[PDB]
A paper describes a structure:
The Notch signalling pathway is conserved across all metazoan species and plays key roles in many aspects of cell biology including cell‐fate determination, stem cell maintenance, immune system activation and angiogenesis in humans (Guruharsha et al, 2012; Bray, 2016). Aberrant Notch signalling results in a number of inherited and acquired disorders, including various cancers, and it is therefore a key target for therapeutic intervention (Hansson et al, 2004; Groth & Fortini, 2012). Both the Notch receptors and the ligands are single‐pass type I transmembrane proteins, and direct protein–protein contact between adjacent cells initiates an intracellular signalling pathway. All of the Notch ligands have a modular extracellular architecture consisting of an N‐terminal C2 domain (formerly known as the MNNL domain), a Delta/Serrate/Lag‐2 (DSL) domain, and either 16 (Jagged1/Jagged2), 8 (Delta‐like1/Delta‐like4) or 7 (Delta‐like3) EGF repeats. Binding of a Notch ligand to [name]‐12 of a Notch receptor results in a series of proteolytic cleavages, with the final intra‐membrane cleavage by gamma secretase, causing the release of the intracellular domain of Notch (NICD) from the plasma membrane.
We have also solved the structure of human [name] [name]‐13, which includes the ligand‐binding region ([name]‐12). Human [name] [name]‐13 has 67% sequence identity with human Notch1, and superposition of the two structures shows that both adopt a very similar linear arrangement (RMSD = 1.55 Å). In our crystal structure, [name] is O‐fucosylated on Thr‐470, and O‐glycosylated on Ser‐462 and Ser‐500. In the earlier Notch1‐Delta‐like4 structure, the O‐fucose on the equivalent threonine residue in EGF12 is seen to be involved in direct intermolecular binding to the C2 domain (Taylor et al, 2014; Luca et al, 2015). In contrast, the O‐glucose modifications affecting specific serine residues in [name] appear to stabilize intramolecular structure as observed previously for the Notch1 complex (Luca et al, 2015): the disaccharide (glucose + xylose) on Ser‐462 may stabilize [name] EGF12 through interaction with Phe‐478 (shown), shielding it from the solvent. Similarly, the O‐glucose on Ser‐500 may stabilize EGF13 through interaction with Phe‐516. The availability of our new structures of hJagged2, hDelta‐like4 and hNotch2 allows modelling of the receptor‐binding interface across all canonical ligands and Notch1/[name] and show that almost all of the key residues involved in ligand binding (Leu‐468, Asp‐469 and Ile‐477 in site 1; Phe‐436 and Arg‐448 in site 2) are conserved in [name]. All canonical human Notch ligands (Jagged1, Jagged2, Delta‐like1 and Delta‐like4) (N‐EGF3) bind to both human Notch1 (i) and [name] (ii) [name]‐13 to a similar extent as assessed by plate assay.
Residue numbers in the entry: 415 to 532
The structure:
Amino acid sequence: DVDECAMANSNPCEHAGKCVNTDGAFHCECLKGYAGPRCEMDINECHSDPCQNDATCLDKIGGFTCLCMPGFKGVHCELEINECQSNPCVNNGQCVDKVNRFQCLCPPGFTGPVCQID
Ligand SMILES: *[C@@H]1O[C@H](CO)[C@@H](O)[C@H](O[C@@H]2OC[C@@H](O)[C@H](O)[C@H]2O)[C@H]1O
Ligand SMILES: *[C@@H]1O[C@H](CO)[C@@H](O)[C@H](O)[C@H]1O
Ligand SMILES: *[C@@H]1O[C@@H](C)[C@@H](O)[C@@H](O)[C@@H]1O
Ligand SMILES: [Ca+2]
Ligand SMILES: [Ca+2]
Ligand SMILES: [Ca+2]
């Protein structure tokens, strides 16, 4: 048998996989996110569709990241930002939290996006 893990100048496994010599061939212990007989395959962690609310899943090494639609947040984009948190309405306007925006319900006699015009 040839020791592919010892006689090699560089790792015969891909992606820093750990070479384990066997009789007639060799084995590769793959790090997280890699698969295949030589760890050559990058696992697509986005195949399970983890991102919610029409977010876009980007495949990463041993994981993923979600690009949220505007107005959403969280690991899976499962939360909605509350644009009313900053108290945008003035003149005692009531703030309604929408997706990626707020709406100020103004008391009669006031207009404007945040009820700033008497
Ligand atoms: C397939 O969908 C799952 C829904 O939650 C998701 O967990 C899976 O994600 C992975 O799990 C969480 C993250 O921390 C890991 O890095 C990732 O492998 C997804 O693949
Ligand atoms: C927080 O308040 C500001 C105005 O002060 C507004 O621009 C933001 O949209 C709101 O979320
Ligand atoms: C991925 O990103 C999200 C935010 C949406 O714009 C999708 O349409 C896109 O494919
Ligand atoms: Ca061998
Ligand atoms: Ca991946
Ligand atoms: Ca919102």
